Amino acid sequence: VMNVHSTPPGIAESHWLGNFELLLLDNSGELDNHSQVLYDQIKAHFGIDSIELKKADSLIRINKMKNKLNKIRAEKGK
Amino acid sequence: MTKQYERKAKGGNLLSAFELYQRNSDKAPGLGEMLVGEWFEMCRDYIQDGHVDESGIFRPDNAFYLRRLTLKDFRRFSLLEIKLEEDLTVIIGNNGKGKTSILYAIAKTLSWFVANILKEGGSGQRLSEMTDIKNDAEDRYSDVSSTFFFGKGLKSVPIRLSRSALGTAERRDSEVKPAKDLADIWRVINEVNTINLPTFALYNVERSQPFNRNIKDNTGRREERFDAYSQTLGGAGRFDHFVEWYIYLHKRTVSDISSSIKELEQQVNDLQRTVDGGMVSVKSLLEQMKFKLSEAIERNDAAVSSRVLTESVQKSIVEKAICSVVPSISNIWVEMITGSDLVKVTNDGHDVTIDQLSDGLRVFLSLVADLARRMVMLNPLLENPLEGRGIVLIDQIELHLHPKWQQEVILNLRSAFPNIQFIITTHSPIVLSTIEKRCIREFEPNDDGDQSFLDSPDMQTKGSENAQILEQVMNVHSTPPGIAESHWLGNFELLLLDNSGELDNHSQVLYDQIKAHFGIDSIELKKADSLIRINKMKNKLNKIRAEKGK
Amino acid sequence: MRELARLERPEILDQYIAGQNDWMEIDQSAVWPKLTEMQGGFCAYCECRLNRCHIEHFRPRGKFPALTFIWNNLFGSCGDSRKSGGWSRCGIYKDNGAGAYNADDLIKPDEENPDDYLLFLTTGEVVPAIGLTGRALKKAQETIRVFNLNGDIKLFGSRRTAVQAIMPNVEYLYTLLEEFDEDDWNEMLRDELEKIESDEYKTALKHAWTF
Numbered sequence A: 001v002m003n004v005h006s007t008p009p010g011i012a013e014s015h016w017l018g019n020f021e022l023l024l025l026d027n028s029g030e031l032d033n034h035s036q037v038l039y040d041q042i043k044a045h046f047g048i049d050s051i052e053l054k055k056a057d058s059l060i061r062i063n064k065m066k067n068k069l070n071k072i073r074a075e076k077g078k
Numbered sequence B: 001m002t003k004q005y006e007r008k009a010k011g012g013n014l015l016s017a018f019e020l021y022q023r024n025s026d027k028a029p030g031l032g033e034m035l036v037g038e039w040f041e042m043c044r045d046y047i048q049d050g051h052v053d054e055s056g057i058f059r060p061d062n063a064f065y066l067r068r069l070t071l072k073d074f075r076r077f078s079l080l081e082i083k084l085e086e087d088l089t090v091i092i093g094n095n096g097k098g099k100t101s102i103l104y105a106i107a108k109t110l111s112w113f114v115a116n117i118l119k120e121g122g123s124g125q126r127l128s129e130m131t132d133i134k135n136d137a138e139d140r141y142s143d144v145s146s147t148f149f150f151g152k153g154l155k156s157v158p159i160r161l162s163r164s165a166l167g168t169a170e171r172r173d174s175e176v177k178p179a180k181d182l183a184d185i186w187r188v189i190n191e192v193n194t195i196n197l198p199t200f201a202l203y204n205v206e207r208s209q210p211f212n213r214n215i216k217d218n219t220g221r222r223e224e225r226f227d228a229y230s231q232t233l234g235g236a237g238r239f240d241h242f243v244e245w246y247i248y249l250h251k252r253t254v255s256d257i258s259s260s261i262k263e264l265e266q267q268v269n270d271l272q273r274t275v276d277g278g279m280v281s282v283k284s285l286l287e288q289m290k291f292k293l294s295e296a297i298e299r300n301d302a303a304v305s306s307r308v309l310t311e312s313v314q315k316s317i318v319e320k321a322i323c324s325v326v327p328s329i330s331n332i333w334v335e336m337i338t339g340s341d342l343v344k345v346t347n348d349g350h351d352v353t354i355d356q357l358s359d360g361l362r363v364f365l366s367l368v369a370d371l372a373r374r375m376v377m378l379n380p381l382l383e384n385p386l387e388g389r390g391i392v393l394i395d396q397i398e399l400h401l402h403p404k405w406q407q408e409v410i411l412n413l414r415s416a417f418p419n420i421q422f423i424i425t426t427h428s429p430i431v432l433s434t435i436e437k438r439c440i441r442e443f444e445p446n447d448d449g450d451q452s453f454l455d456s457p458d459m460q461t462k463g464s465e466n467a468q469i470l471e472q473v474m475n476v477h478s479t480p481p482g483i484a485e486s487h488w489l490g491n492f493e494l495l496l497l498d499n500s501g502e503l504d505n506h507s508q509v510l511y512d513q514i515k516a517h518f519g520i521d522s523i524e525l526k527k528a529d530s531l532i533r534i535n536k537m538k539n540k541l542n543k544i545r546a547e548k549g550k
Numbered sequence C: 001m002r003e004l005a006r007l008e009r010p011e012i013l014d015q016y017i018a019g020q021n022d023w024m025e026i027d028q029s030a031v032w033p034k035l036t037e038m039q040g041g042f043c044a045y046c047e048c049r050l051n052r053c054h055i056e057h058f059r060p061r062g063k064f065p066a067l068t069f070i071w072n073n074l075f076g077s078c079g080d081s082r083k084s085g086g087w088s089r090c091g092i093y094k095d096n097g098a099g100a101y102n103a104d105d106l107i108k109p110d111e112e113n114p115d116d117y118l119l120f121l122t123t124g125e126v127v128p129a130i131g132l133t134g135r136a137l138k139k140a141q142e143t144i145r146v147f148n149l150n151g152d153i154k155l156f157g158s159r160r161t162a163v164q165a166i167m168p169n170v171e172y173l174y175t176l177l178e179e180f181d182e183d184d185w186n187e188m189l190r191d192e193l194e195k196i197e198s199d200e201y202k203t204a205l206k207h208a209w210t211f
Helices: A016-027 A033-045 A051-076 B002-011 B014-024 B035-048 B099-118 B177-190 B239-256 B265-274 B283-287 B290-298 B300-304 B311-325 B365-378 B409-416 B466-472 B488-498 B507-518 B523-536 B538-549 C032-039 C092-096 C135-147 C153-164 C167-174 C182-198 C203-209
Strands: B050-052 B058-060 B064-074 B077-083 B088-092 B141-150 B157-164 B199-203 B329-337 B340-347 B350-353 B390-395 B420-425 B440-442 C053-057 C074-078 C118-120 C126-128
Touching (some): B014 B035, B064 B420, B099 B390, B099 B420, B141 B177, B239 B311, B290 B300, B365 B390, B365 B409, B409 B420, B466 C153, B488 B523, B488 C126, B507 B523, C092 C135, C126 C135, C182 C203
Parallel strands (some): B088 B420
Antiparallel strands (some): B050 B058, B064 B141, B141 B157, B329 B340
């Protein structure tokens, strides 16, 4: 209605959760050094009691279990 | 006694050299040769040293700000201690928590600084004895205690402002002597050599005022530096002074500096034409223009000379500040029509005159323009006069502003004025979404006045969602509890778990109300559908677990 | 809330006896490592992370003065008493707000199971459990009314967003029930029972995951 985003667009810390899901989907799970550094910045800036860390944990484990479905596909493949 | 003061001056102190300057300045040279000069040079260094960092912003070596504020029996506060940040301090709370009272007390404290800078031995504003005294308190006096920081040589500048109700046995008084001393140092070094005075400003609710545009307030004074302190802590931004100053700058830019000074000499030549026409009979305009030349001699010499920078650069800097901070206005310029001189801006690509600007884009321009005016008039020895020191007290920065424009107001203000300690008191979560956790003071919604501290919120607000800031910091539901249409998901889950997850008689018709109300593409119906599928296949898991168990 | 396994009585409170001295005489640091082993460092009233914490007496000390030094009365409290007013949940709210209440009108997490009397919905709101009538229903209303779960904003919104943050997880893990087999699909739910205890909210996510 206002066309106003939930996070401010002028703050580079606002797009950390936006970039985390894009990097995690680009890597297709199995978090690398860049994703671990980004999780470290979220852990440093936002607290342990933060919605960004809760959503990051949820995305990490849903893509981990998605990779486990690919692991399930690995036996019946080839 | 002299040796101890000289040792303290060698160790680093602004005040220790001041009485040395005051005791050796009154005698003759020879006994004062290099003696007064070294303390003057060291004092002017301690005021004027600054460096450009890696980001390109001038940062003073001796920053000036307010450290602590203590209110005892003041209005609703029994004994409240507030620790203020260096760059930005935000005070949030309900209507009723004394967060305008804090700004009022700090403004009453800064009034002594302003008055003692402006006139030697001056008196600032005083506390009222009818409303500021706590009507529950039994001591019948109220004091406001502040501490100021002015570098490593000046750790503490205490000040107390006391006021007693009428009928007390002991008359409580102020201890404004360190404020007197610091403003005395600034004024008596400014009278003999130009420095960069700090900006003290208060933008209270009364900036929300209509524009008259027929304003012929006293013409002639609105170009002198100490006019910048005129009613600066009143509460309302002096947009009248700004627009008069800006018409002055437009006339001086287009006429007085493009092809030298002409509008005075043309009527000087008119007097030389009419001086020998016979009977003179022109004594009314013989002398009223003769001191206009004296005015342009003894007032414009400061502005053109080495103390105050070039006037076209002043116009460019205030225009750059206005179009940088003020959101949709991108240019500001003056038209001269026959008999009229009016300022117009480019608001969203439309040339709009000031008086018919919107009330949410004009009372922020009244802040930014007046603040930029006072910085460019009070800090003229800088490449960017917006990087000067000072204390600015904005009350409700989110006033009349759209939530689109609240996402960048304090970022733009802190970008344009880096060395100003802003002290703002907002109500909106969206402003808090651009402000760090440590910059926020808060009031709990049970705060009868007994607290001795104001503390930051637990969660970080710099990148959090507006619903999270509203529902964790400001203690407000995201969906209203006074609406029966908002609890429909909760009643849906209660009536759906009553019959073990089946849409039999109540859940189906209440689902029909949700679908007919919120809409087909609604996120509430999306949660409702997801919970319907998850709880209808839960009975399958119940049957499978029952078959496994027995 | 959670089953708290009342393991062993500490030997700190055996020497001090009620009536001779008040609660303030004992040092407060010798009981917290005993309590955090069975609580996980959690307020067991708001089911609740202890960033700041203090010791809360389940039954009040002023009314039952010879009950404080039994160790069946000591629990953790969401927040601390040093706030000049305190919070409005868990331990502070019972001693400051609410009103009159009975000792048997409260649920005790040491032996009584809170799973079959109160129910955490997916929206973060607590309701009484289905089929519950009478004295236990009045108890289930009274505990929520004195502990402010249906109540203060910082608890209710945080529980709501913690439950709502795993709804795609629950949906996509449950929609593959026919795709996966019995033992390796219940291995997912034992993975959740090994997952959820390193969080703030445990029984709410238990009610969101299974029933």
